[PDB]
Amino acid sequence: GLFDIVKKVVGAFGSL
């Protein structure tokens, strides 16, 4: 896992 998780990361600021 290193591509599917990256989603969650940028997901945080997915709405600030």
Side-chain angles (χ1 to χ4, degrees), residues 1-4 6 8-16:
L2 73 187
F3 185 84
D4 61 315
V6 181
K8 184 167 65 164
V9 190
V10 296
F13 309 92
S15 69
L16 171 51

